Amino acid sequence: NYTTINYYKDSASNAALQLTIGNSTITNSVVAYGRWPEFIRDDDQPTEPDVATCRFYTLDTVMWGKESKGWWWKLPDALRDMGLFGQNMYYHYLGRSGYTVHVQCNASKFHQGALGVFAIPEYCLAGDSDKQRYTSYANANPGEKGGKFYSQFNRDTAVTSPKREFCPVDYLLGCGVLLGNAFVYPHQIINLRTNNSATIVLPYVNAMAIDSMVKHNNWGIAILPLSPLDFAQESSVEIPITVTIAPMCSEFNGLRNVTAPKFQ
Amino acid sequence: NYTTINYYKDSASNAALQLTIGNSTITNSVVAYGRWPEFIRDDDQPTEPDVATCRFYTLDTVMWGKESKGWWWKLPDALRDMGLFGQNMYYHYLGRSGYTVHVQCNASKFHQGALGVFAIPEYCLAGDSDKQRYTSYANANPGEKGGKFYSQFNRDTAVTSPKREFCPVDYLLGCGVLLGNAFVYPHQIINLRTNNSATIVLPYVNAMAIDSMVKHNNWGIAILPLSPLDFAQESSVEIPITVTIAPMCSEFNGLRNVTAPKFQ
Amino acid sequence: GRSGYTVHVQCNASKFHQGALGVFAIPEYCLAGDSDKQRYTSYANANPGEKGGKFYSQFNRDTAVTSPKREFCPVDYLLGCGVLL
Amino acid sequence: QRRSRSESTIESFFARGACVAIIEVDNEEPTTRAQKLFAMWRITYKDTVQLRRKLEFFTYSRFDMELTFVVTANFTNTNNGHALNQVYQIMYIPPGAPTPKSWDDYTWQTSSNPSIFYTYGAAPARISVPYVGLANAYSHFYDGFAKVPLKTDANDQIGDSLYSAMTVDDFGVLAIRVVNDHNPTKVTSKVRIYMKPKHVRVWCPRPPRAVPYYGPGVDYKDNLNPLSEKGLTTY
Amino acid sequence: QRRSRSESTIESFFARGACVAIIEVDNEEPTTRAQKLFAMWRITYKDTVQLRRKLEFFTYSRFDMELTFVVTANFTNTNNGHALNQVYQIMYIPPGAPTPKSWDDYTWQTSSNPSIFYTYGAAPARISVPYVGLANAYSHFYDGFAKVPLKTDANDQIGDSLYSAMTVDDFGVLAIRVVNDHNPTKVTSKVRIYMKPKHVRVWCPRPPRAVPYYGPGVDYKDNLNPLSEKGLTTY
Amino acid sequence: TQDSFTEGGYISMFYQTRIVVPLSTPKSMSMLGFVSACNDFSVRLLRDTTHISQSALP
């Protein structure tokens, strides 16, 4: 074989069913990257509410019709005002947690339509102005209500009082990539002719073992209608969509006074 | 592992309580660098007065008030006129010795103040003129009396008859460095509410095993008030400070006629 | 709910001061009212919270039927419950 | 035998040098008006689009770096004389270190900052850098801010920060100068920097960019119609 | 794993080249008036401030040295012709050895003194030096004199000496010349010397300099207010 | 260097009780502060400092 000896001392120089959680119960699931949520490994005492925070919280129901273009949420932003989980978030400097997301949508055998649910790590969205990275904290953290997609890019032509809001586009996924490839991310498809619910399990993903839960969002959830809703020969159709999220294996550290962000 | 062979023959080319001493007795201590004074190792017969020179000598008492800015002494300069130690100094060409320094200052429970005592190797002070390194031997070796610090730099604007004297500054330690870092040197703190005395043990420190004691000073002692003196609601307060120094493990060599420096 | 407690009382003075404080922990500490009506104290007045309450050297009856205060009237030497201190 | 996937590995996928910086430096007589006697470049991989697009296939990465420098010089006028061979100095300034204000200030002593002296006409310069990430991996995408506005803040500018940015200064800068004095004739030079990742690990694959980049972020402005026309039943 | 202190060692702290000398040498027709045909530089590390400040963290030191030389040349006029590649001679003159009085005197025979001949356009010159201290370690600070005045001295100048100085001549000097004869056109050149300590040992740590240096000693003249303003109860 | 993404926190001091002195005693006093590192401290990526400068060569 060919001979090789490394000269320098540095390595760089070298040549190259029912699910019950806590006091909540909901009656196949998808695990992101095949990794179940877990606590920090062996390699300041953390606080861990075993059941006061690891349970299912239900968000506000939304309506799906013939003109809906999609919805998106950010985690852990969406759960900032849910029981003691939010209190622990705002009373500590460092936090960590995984999630279990459950999407519910029921219809009849005479309806038709398909929804795509995508879980995206580090889901960064585009703005609505010539200025770059000018979106504000308040607009980037809607909370429980979340946001919506659009079919076109509407530039905010107002220099007097810029809105500083996102302008996602459905077929660009709001980030400049084609929607067809979004299936690279963890995903589920709800087809009304086969099923009525979707489930995803998300572990903690980040470049650090633990990070602030207030200034950084680890996950994004996007729901988009792949096929339009229809029902018999009716002009208008509307059905509800519900989202339920459960924290799992949550840890907090850095206890001090409480944080009170200015949301408008 | 990486392979390496040295080619050149030269290494440089290679890639990279009561303490009693002699007939003196004084009724925790600090050892500089954790090294006790010792005689020269195995690696002209030296002369060594075991007890005629290794004993405590007391200097002149000074007064501490509300405007005092500090005091400094040089060793072995301060002991040049102390018994047979000075005679041995001036009758020999080479000398060596360590020291034990004891600072005494007593007050009442209703006084307050703090003193910092610092032992500095190769304590070089700044001048008082535009000319550089122009200080004279007589002014640089005050002797028992020692010198004092100042709160500002007073330039000697007199070319007719320059004084050629030091101009130390308290917050610059007289050498261009911040006083707060002087604790890098061996040090003691005398706080009137806890103690009334300080003790330091200094070994012999120099680039040579033995050196002349007349043209080179090995140690400097600096005393500075870290907190101002106060007493009840009195306008003026003065208390005495005393210094006692004991040579330890002293050796001399190079006997010839006596040296008589011209001190003014 | 259930819990135990650790209570720490701090009070510092000089060598030239003098005085003595007694701290007592009482289970089921029930206090007396300030009116002829019996057990008429209100929830709000019986749960002051962090501020707490104070004792008195005498019993001051609340002679107001129009708008009764419904407050405790503890007495120092009776411990506020009818027993000697 | 059977076909192998040797060349589709991450290491093979990133085993090429890519340009990230073109920097202009001039040697001439100093004057009152603005000049390019020394240049300062902020380190980043987003100036170009090829290596950026290749890297953005993944969310997290961890690698060492190999940097190569190619220098090309030329004249500007033809009635001033000639020049002797020049020497170029390249200094790395990490965050917090003092920055030059002139081509001959004390900062060029480089007592602690690493520096390269390159002689024109020799082989292109080359150095290697280890992984210097504060966290356990580099983050190509960061959904968050560096400050959080608070209700008790005096004004709204205390907590304002750019979206999807970690630090104002990251990885420092590079300062390039010509050590030689000025000849009577002006001489221009360009330094091209080529970067090669080594010992690469990646996490969280991501769909590639489909529309032209617009700034350091994910914003898009123009040319949002990439796909072309074709018949449904046309081969 | 756990974090290491590999890069905070003394050897790593001093493992960089630092400039200590910039020397000008000219090649032109000799004339009656003063010229720079050959230059002599006194060896020291106090000309600059970065390496000096790094070294003054300690009272005593012991190390070997690595020296590197970078040469850059240029023209001055444009109506005299051109020149061929030049050769530079660098000679080390220890104390007591004869010193040149002209660019072509016998002293350049360098029968015993070491010398380096450098050809312009080649790689920067480099050499290594061992520890050459008379004592057991180098003394960055010396509180004393070299002479002691005596009562029997005829005058006061017999025993006068500079404070905090050991020897008038220490470590010798370096003499640099251009071996080639003079072309019809003048050519200027600068030699930059970079120094790297190796095999370093230190003793008696010392607080660093806080105010600008003023001369070889510890004297201070101006800018004695380094710290800035801040609020006592301001974060 | 100063950076919000790597801020460390805040240090504050308050009176738990007040300072009490008897008569014939000073009512004002001074306090000093010191800082140091522990055995679990490390640094990385040597660079030049901004605390020393130069304008002319000797």
Ligand SMILES: Cc1cc(CCCOc2c(C)cc(-c3noc(C(F)(F)F)n3)cc2C)on1
């Ligand atoms: C992700 C990612 C990684 C990077 C670049 C990290 C490396 O940054 C550098 C570079 C480009 C050069 C040097 C460098 N070291 O030395 C020199 C010099 F000697 F050439 F000046 N340059 C040091 C770092 C940390 O940027 N984004």
Ligand SMILES: Cc1cc(CCCOc2c(C)cc(-c3noc(C(F)(F)F)n3)cc2C)on1
């Ligand atoms: C402390 C301290 C250490 C020093 C410098 C000591 C080394 O001095 C030299 C230098 C800088 C160069 C040479 C030298 N030897 O050879 C050459 C030449 F060949 F390049 F000429 N230069 C020799 C000594 C002793 O200065 N202060």
Ligand SMILES: N[C@@H](CCC(=O)N[C@@H](CS)C(=O)NCC(=O)O)C(=O)O
């Ligand atoms: N600009 C002045 C100062 C030049 C100079 O020598 N500067 C010193 C510091 S004051 C230096 O080290 N410059 C960087 C270098 O040229 O290596 C001049 O050209 O005369």
